[PDB]
Amino acid sequence: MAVSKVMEKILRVSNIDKIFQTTTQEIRQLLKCDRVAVYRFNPDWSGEFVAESVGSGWVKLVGPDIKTVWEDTYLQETQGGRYRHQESTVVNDIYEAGYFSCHLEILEQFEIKAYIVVPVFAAEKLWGLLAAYQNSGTREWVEWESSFLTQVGLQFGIAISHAEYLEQTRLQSE
Numbered sequence: 496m497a498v499s500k501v502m503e504k505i506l507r508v509s510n511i512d513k514i515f516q517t518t519t520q521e522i523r524q525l526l527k528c529d530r531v532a533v534y535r536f537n538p539d540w541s542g543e544f545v546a547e548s549v550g551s552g553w554v555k556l557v558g559p560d561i562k563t564v565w566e567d568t569y570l571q572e573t574q575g576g577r578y579r580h581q582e583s584t585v586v587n588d589i590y591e592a593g594y595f596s597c598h599l600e601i602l603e604q605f606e607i608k609a610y611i612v613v614p615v616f617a618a619e620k621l622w623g624l625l626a627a628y629q630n631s632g633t634r635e636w637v638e639w640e641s642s643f644l645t646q647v648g649l650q651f652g653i654a655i656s657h658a659e660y661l662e663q664t665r666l667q668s669e
């Protein structure tokens with residue numbers, strides 16, 4: 496077996512897209528929520544949704560023909576917000592959160608009423624965000640839900656780190 500292929504097998508990251516897809520579904524089922532999504536930052540701290548599980552009837556953000564970019568002004572200004580410092584955000588009702596109109600408009604376009612978002616770190620860098628969304632109504636999230644999502648964020652982060660590691664072994668022999 497080829498070195499890079501044995502590694503891939505040891506680090507458990509054959510096919511990171513399938514990992515994201517199946518895991519977001521499993522989380523969505525556990526949390527009984529309406530969407531679970533993985534969002535990847537661009538160097539300018541804009542970014543896009545790369546994977547999701549989404550319930551019956553809600554707008555889809557990921558797919559063959561779809562591409563959902565969210566350039567968030569606040570996250571761009573701050574280079575990843577509080578998520579840089581490994582903090583999580585828990586919002587039971589977006590209308591009680593004290594947001595600005597233009598941010599609320601984006602949340603409404605995604606049919607979000609309540610959500611959790613946690614960091615996804617790759618190496619020591621903030622790579623993206625993992626979020627769970629309630630679309631049907633407000634929701635009072637509980638600590639086990641947000642601590643678990645945080646724990647999955649760590650899992651996704653390491654998986655991405657393995658993928659970047661393997662990628663960045665670009666053209667060394669052995």
Ligand SMILES: */C=C/C1=C(C)C(=O)N/C1=C\C1=NC(=C\c2[nH]c(/C=C3\NC(=O)C(C=C)=C3C)c(C)c2CCC(=O)O)/C(CCC(=O)O)=C1C
Nearest residue numbers: 534565566567568569584593594595597598601612624626
């Ligand atoms: C009003 C200009 C803005 C445009 C256009 C825009 O897209 N965002 C704009 C402003 C603000 N965003 C603010 C906070 C904020 N943004 C996000 C981003 C996401 N949430 C997610 O679920 C995903 C994808 C998984 C992204 C990319 C987050 C997490 C937050 C933090 C919310 C919080 O801490 O509760 C923001 C500050 C809050 C506000 O005053 O509205 C502004 C102004």
